[PDB]
Every structure is written in structure tokens, then in C-alpha cells.
Amino acid sequence: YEHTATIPNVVGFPYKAHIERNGFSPMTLQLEVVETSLEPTLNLEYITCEYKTVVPSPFIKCCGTSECSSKEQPDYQCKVYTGVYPFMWGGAYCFCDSENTQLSEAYVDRSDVCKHDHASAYKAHTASLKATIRISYGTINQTTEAFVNGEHAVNVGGSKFIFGPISTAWSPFDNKIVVYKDDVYNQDFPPYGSGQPGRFGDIQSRTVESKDLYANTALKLSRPSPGVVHVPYTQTPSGFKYWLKEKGSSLNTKAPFGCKIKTNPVRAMDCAVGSIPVSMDIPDSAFTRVVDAPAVTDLSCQVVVCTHSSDFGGVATLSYKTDKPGDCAVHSHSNVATLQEATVKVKTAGKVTVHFSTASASPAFKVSVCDAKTTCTAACEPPKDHIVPYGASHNNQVFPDMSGTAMTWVQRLASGLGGLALIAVVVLVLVTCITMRR
Amino acid sequence: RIIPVTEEGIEYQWGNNPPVRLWAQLTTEGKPHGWPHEIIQYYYGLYPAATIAAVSGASLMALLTLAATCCMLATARRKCLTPYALTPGAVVPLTLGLLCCAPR
Numbered sequence: 001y002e003h004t005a006t007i008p009n010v011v012g013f014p015y016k017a018h019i020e021r022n023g024f025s026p027m028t029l030q031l032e033v034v035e036t037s038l039e040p041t042l043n044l045e046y047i048t049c050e051y052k053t054v055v056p057s058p059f060i061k062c063c064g065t066s067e068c069s070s071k072e073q074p075d076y077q078c079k080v081y082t083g084v085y086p087f088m089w090g091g092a093y094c095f096c097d098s099e100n101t102q103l104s105e106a107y108v109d110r111s112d113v114c115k116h117d118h119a120s121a122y123k124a125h126t127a128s129l130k131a132t133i134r135i136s137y138g139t140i141n142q143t144t145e146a147f148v149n150g151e152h153a154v155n156v157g158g159s160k161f162i163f164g165p166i167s168t169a170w171s172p173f174d175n176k177i178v179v180y181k182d183d184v185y186n187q188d189f190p191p192y193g194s195g196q197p198g199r200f201g202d203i204q205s206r207t208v209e210s211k212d213l214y215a216n217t218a219l220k221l222s223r224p225s226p227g228v229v230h231v232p233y234t235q236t237p238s239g240f241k242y243w244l245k246e247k248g249s250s251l252n253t254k255a256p257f258g259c260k261i262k263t264n265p266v267r268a269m270d271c272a273v274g275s276i277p278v279s280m281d282i283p284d285s286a287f288t289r290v291v292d293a294p295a296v297t298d299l300s301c302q303v304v305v306c307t308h309s310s311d312f313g314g315v316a317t318l319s320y321k322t323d324k325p326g327d328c329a330v331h332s333h334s335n336v337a338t339l340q341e342a343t344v345k346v347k348t349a350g351k352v353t354v355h356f357s358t359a360s361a362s363p364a365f366k367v368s369v370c371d372a373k374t375t376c377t378a379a380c381e382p383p384k385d386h387i388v389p390y391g392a393s394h395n396n397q398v399f400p401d402m403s404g405t406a407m408t409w410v411q412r413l414a415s416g417l418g419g420l421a422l423i424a425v426v427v428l429v430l431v432t433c434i435t436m437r438r
Numbered sequence: 439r440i441i442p443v444t445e446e447g448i449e450y451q452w453g454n455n456p457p458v459r460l461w462a463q464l465t466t467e468g469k470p471h472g473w474p475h476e477i478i479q480y481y482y483g484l485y486p487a488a489t490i491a492a493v494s495g496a497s498l499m500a501l502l503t504l505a506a507t508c509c510m511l512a513t514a515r516r517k518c519l520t521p522y523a524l525t526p527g528a529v530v531p532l533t534l535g536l537l538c539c540a541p542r
Contacts, residue, residue, distance in 0.1 A: 258449060258459075310463050361470035361480070379471055382480070383463045387443055391461055396445075398464075398485075405471045406481075410496075417503045424510040431514040438521065 005278045007031050009131075009166065010391070011270045016342050018331035018368075019282060025293035025370055027137055027286065028329040028342035031278060034143055035132035038259070039267040040124035040173045046192045047205040048121060049114035050238045051217055058224070058231045059103040060086055062094035066103050074203070074215035075108040077233070086229040093229065102224050104231045108203065108215040115208060119180040119240065121189045121201070124173040124266070129166050131276065135159070137342075138286060148276055159286065164277030172255035172268050183250035184261050195239070202239035290371075294326035294346045299372035304353070306363075306380035310392040312340045312355045313383065316376055318369055319351040330354060334365035335395040337376075344369060357393040362404030377403060515539070 007015040014032040021027075059066060068078040084102045086093040094100045111117075129148040136142070140157040150164045178185040178200070187200070195201030197218035204214040218236040225232065252261040259268040299320040307313035314337065330344045337358040344352050346369065354367065358380055366375040400406050441448055447461035466483025469476040482489040515538045522530045522540070530540035 253451070258447075308464055310461060359464065382466050382470065382484070384465065385463060386465045387460050387462050389458075389460060391447065392445070406477050409474055409477070413500070417500060417507075421503050421507050421510075424507040424514075428510045428514045431518050435517050435521075 001282055003280045003282065005031070005280065006167075007033065007276050007278055008395075009033065009036065009274045009276050010272055011036065013391070013393070016331060016339065017278070017280065018329065018333075019280070021282075021287060023290070024284075024287035025290055026329040026331070026368065027282075028331050029135065029137040029280070030342050032134040032136075033131055033276070034134050035269065036129060036148070036271060037131070037267045037269055038127050038129045038171055038271055039265055040127040040171060040177070042122040042124055042177070042179075042266060044207070045121045045123060045176075045189070046201070047114070047118050047208050047210075048189075048195075048201050048203065048240050049118035049205075050111045050240045051203045051215060052109045052111040053106060053217075053219065053233075053235060054109055055106045055231050055233065058229055059105075060084065060093060060100065060229060061103070062100050063096040064099070064101070066101050068103060068105075071107070073107040073109075074213045075217050075219045076105075077107065077219050077221050078103070078105045079221050080104075081223050084224055085227065086224070087227050088229065102229075102231075104221045104224065104233075106219060106221060106231065106233050108213075108217050108219060110203065110205060110213055114205075118208065119178055119200075119243070121187075122177040122179055122266070123175060124171075124177040125175065127171040127173065127268075131163060133161070133163065135161065140286070150277075150279075157286070158283045160281040162279040164279060166274050166276060168274035170257075170273050172251060172257070172259050172261070172271070173266070177266065179263055179266055180247075182263055183247070183252065184263060184266055185247060185250055197236035197239065198242060199239045200243045202236070292326075293370055294328060295321075295323040296328055296346055296370040296372045297321045299369050299374045301367060301374045301376040303376055303378040306358065306378040307383050308358050308360060308380040308394075309383035309385075310357070310388050310390060310394070312357045312393060314356040314358055314378060314380065316354045316356060316367075316378075317351055318344075318354055318367065318374070320346070320369060320372060321350060322346050322348060328370035330367060330369050332356060332365045332367050334363070336360055336363040336397045336401075337365040337378075338394055339367070340393075346370070359392065359394040359396045360398045360400055361406065362400045363397075364401035364403055377401070379405070 001021060003019050005017040011033050014030050017029045017031055019027050066080055068080050081102045083098050084100045085097060131148050132145050134143045135156045142156050144154050144156055146152050146154045146163045148163045148166045153160045153162045174186040176188050178187040178189055190201050192204050193214050195204050195216055197216055202217050221233050224230055255261055257271045257273045259271040261268055302317050304315040304317055325347045327343050328346050332339045337356045340355040361380055364377050441450060443460055443462045445462050447459060449457050449459045451457035464484050466480055468479030468483050470480045478493060519530060519538055519540060522528055
């Protein structure tokens with residue numbers, strides 16, 4: 001038996017689905033989203049970390065000359081300075097006063113803890129949303145995980161549910177993502193082989209274990225100062241150690257829709273965006289036969305109080321006939337007002353009370369208790385408390401019913417003016433007829 | 439510090455404390471079941487721009503419809519009384535002159 005619904009993608013909003021299977025007493029299912037996890041497909045572009053600059057002891061050649069050579073090492077710099085005369089602590093190092101050279105050599109390397117302290121630059125696309133849904137009905141009250149696509153059917157008490165494709169393509173991750181430990185950053189990092197000195201990615205590695213390394217740190221050597229053995233050089237400070245203080249706060253503090261961002265794996269939890277279709281197949285053991293249900297009849301509704309507050313600020317009393325005591329499914333057939341309870345005990349006392357939440361000055365929702373139907377009309381006052389620590393339990397439908405006071409005044413004014421206009425029309429038509437016959 | 443809170447809500451975090459979420463309710467100054475101006479005050483309170491627009495639109499349509507009723511009844515009067523006003527030897531009859539409010 002197929003049935004379908006569409007629950008809000010709102011965590012902890014306990015949407016209630018009503019099934020009116022014609023052979024059976026109705027049932028209300030509660031479908032509460034316990035978690036969602038929107039996880040992008042990630043392709044790693046490269047790894048960035050702090051560089052190490054290797055500066056060996058200078059090869060000072062006393063009484064002679066030396067020649068530099070090229071080497072296959074990142075950002076490698078090598079120059080031979082002629083006419084050095086270095087002093088060590090005990091005296092001049094060379095006997096030749098000017099016939100000496102210093103070979104100054106330096107190059108960049110991946111730092112020794114880049115195994116442990118690195119930022120991984122990713123492309124993030126084609127996100128898959130998984131949700132944890134709590135299903136309850138009758139004696140069944142269970143939590144299950146389902147991929148939110150039109151495909152992953154999941155069993156609950158012998159029911160099968162398909163949580164159809166999320167009604168949006170939105171995700172908080174931009175196309176380029178930088179991940180670092182517990183954080184995620186929306187950052188248009190430069191391509192591999194294209195990083196610039198002192199900015200993020202001034203050294204780049206395709207993987208952590210890659211033996212190759214791109215480096216562009218603006219390393220330049222300069223001449224040993226007169227009388228000193230020092231290999232003097234200038235280099236732009238590590239763009240990763242700049243980034244680490246320039247990052248600001250991560251996407252976890254900036255994502256829209258209240259998403260909570262986590263790593264390992266990179267995911268956006270509990271985003272409040274869009275809505276989730278549901279396909280529900282329910283076995284005959286879940287329902288109750290109409291012969292066993294109570295014959296709830298002559299149902300009527302009166303509203304004790306209503307506040308259009310974010311909690312269940314309305315209270316109604318429903319009154320009815322019944323043949324037997326029992327349980328009935330109860331539902332509100334209009335999104336203007338959501339009920340708190342899914343089922344109500346029916347008794348020969350012939351009345352019971354039901355609580356609802358609404359966002360409108362005068363809702364005219366209609367409710368059922370078992371097979372019986374009635375319409376509830378409320379006059380709802382505004383809440384006094386400006387701010388609350390919880391989200392709205394209603395669907396935020398605010399337009400008042402046409403039977404409400406504001407729309408009753410609108411209807412009186414509109415029918416007054418239109419009736420006068422139609423009088424003027426009828427007069428003008430009868431005058432133009434008579435003055436045509438003349 | 440003052441944080442603007444809409445009915446969509448905010449999340450704030452202070453120092454190392456866990457973040458706290460808060461949502462604004464539909465509080466408003468007016469009375470939803472009062473006299474008409476109290477209802478306009480009500481909606482204006484929780485929906486300012488929309489109420490101003492809706493009331494401007496409806497009151498413009500009210501003026502346009504009233505003006506149409508006036509222009510139509512004036513056209514009826516004028517087309518009825520024209521043959522009596524043009525004729526030299528005549529005056530609007532004693533019955534019709536009251537109903538259409540003839541000039542004499």
C-alpha cells in the first residue's frame with residue numbers, strides 16, 4: 001500500500017503523516033528528522049604545509065675557486081661569492097687574502113611535521129545527503145538511517161520507507177574547499193604549480209607521501225658580509241603560517257541555514273534547507289480493522305484558547321459520540337495548524353482536549369478523530385514573549401481565514417463598494433436603454 | 439552588543455562556550471480582532487512593508503471604485519437630463535427633477 005508525504009527538512013520538527021486506508025481505521029505516523037548529514041564528494045588537489053629551508057654550512061674554498069651546479073631540488077639557490085676572507089674565532093680562516101670563494105647554497109623542503117600539520121585543498125561537488133529519521137506509529141518507535149534519494153528503501157517494523165530526493169541542490173561548500181583538522185574553509189586556493197610566495201600554497205604537494213614538491217618561496221641568497229661565515233639569505237615567510245592566522249573563523253561559524261560543519265569526513269550536519277519527500281509502504285498488521293475501531297461520530301470542535309506562538313500555544317476540546325472506548329488517530333488536515341499529539345484516547349465521557357500550534361491570527365484548520373471530521377475556528381492572540389530558545393512548531397502560514405475578523409471586514413467593505421458600483425452600473429444601463437429608445 | 443533576531447533566528451557563541459540559538463516570536467503591538475485600525479496596527483507590527491503596501495493598494499482600489507460609481511451616476515444623470523436641458527420651451531418634470539436633482 002503506497003502512500004506519500006513531504007516532511008520539512010527541519011531537525012526535530014515532528015511532522016505527522018495521516019494515512020486514510022479505506023479498509024481500516026486511520027493511522028497517524030510521526031516522522032521526526034533526528035540528524036542530517038550533507039557530505040560532498042571530495043577530490044584532493046594538493047597538500048600545503050610550512051616549508052623547511054635547508055641551508056648547509058658554506059663551502060669556503062681557501063686559496064682557490066669553486067663552481068656552482070644546478071640540482072633537482074625545489075626553489076634551489078646556489079651562488080659562488082669571490083673575494084671572501086672569513087674570520088673564525090681563532091683568526092682568519094684562509095691564508096690567501098682575496099683568492100678565496102664561498103659557495104652559498106640553500107633550498108626549500110617539506111617540513112618534518114608536514115606529516116601531521118598540513119592543510120588539504122579539495123574540490124567539493126555532488127554532495128549526498130544522508131538523514132537519520134525517527135519513525136513511530138502504534139507500538140513501533142524506532143530510529144533509522146536512510147540516504148535521502150528516491151532509491152534507498154529502509155525497513156521499519158515491516159514497513160518500507162523511501163525518503164525521496166532532497167528538494168534542493170544547495171550545499172554550503174563552494175566548489176573549492178580547504179580542509180584543516182576540524183575546520184573547513186571556502187577558499188579559492190591557487191592551482192597546483194601556481195602558488196605564490198607568502199600566500200597559501202607557496203609550497204604544494206599532490207599527496208602527503210609525494211616525493212615531488214612545488215615550491216615558490218622567493219628564496220634569494222646574498223653575499224656573505226665582510227669577515228663572517230654565515231650564508232646570508234632572504235625568503236618570504238611561510239604562506240601556510242600566514243594563512244593559519246589569516247584564516248578567520250571557519251565555515252562552521254558562517255554556513256547558511258544553520259549548518260554545522262564537521263570533518264573526517266567533511267560534512268554539513270543539520271542544515272534546515274528544503275524538504276524531504278517520503279514514500280511509505282505499510283503492512284496490514286500496522287492498521288486496525290474498522291470493526292475493532294471506535295465508531296466516533298458527531299465530532300465537534302471548540303477552541304479554549306489560542307496564541308499564535310512558536311510552541312503549542314492553542315488548546316481545543318473535541319466532543320463526540322462513540323460506541324466503545326479506544327484509541328483514534330487524530331490529524332489536522334490544514335498546514336495552518338499542527339497538532340501536538342498523533343493519537344487520542346476516545347471514551348464514553350464524549351470529550352477530549354487537543355493541543356495545536358499556529359502562526360495566524362485566525363486559522364480555520366479541520367481535524368479528524370478516527371473517521372469523523374470537524375472544523376476548528378480560532379481567534380488567536382499574539383504572544384507577549386519576544387524571543388524564545390526554540391524554533392517554530394508551526395508551518396508559518398499567517399494568512400487569516402476568510403471567516404476571520406480581518407477578512408470579514410474586507411468582505412464587508414468589498415461587497416459594500418462593489419454592490420454600490422453594480423447599482424451604478426444597473427442605473428447607467430437602464431438610463432442608456434431608455435435614452436436609446438427616446 | 440545587540441544582535442538582530444528575526445523569526446529565522448540567530449546562533450551566537452561567546453568564547454569557548456557552546457553556541458546558543460534564539461528565535462524571535464510573532465510579537466506585535468496591535469490587536470488582531472479589534473477595530474479596523476487596530477488590525478492594521480497588528481499586521482503592521484509583525485509585517486510592516488507588506489501592510490503598508492496592501493493598505494495602499496486596497497485604498498487606491500477603493501478610491502477608483504468609488505470614483506467609478508460617481509462617474510457612472512453622473513453620466514446617467516447627464517444623459518437623462520440632456521433632452522430637458524436643451525429644449526427651449528421646457529423644464530425638468532416635477533417627478534424626475536427630484537430624483538436626478540435637476541438644476542431647477
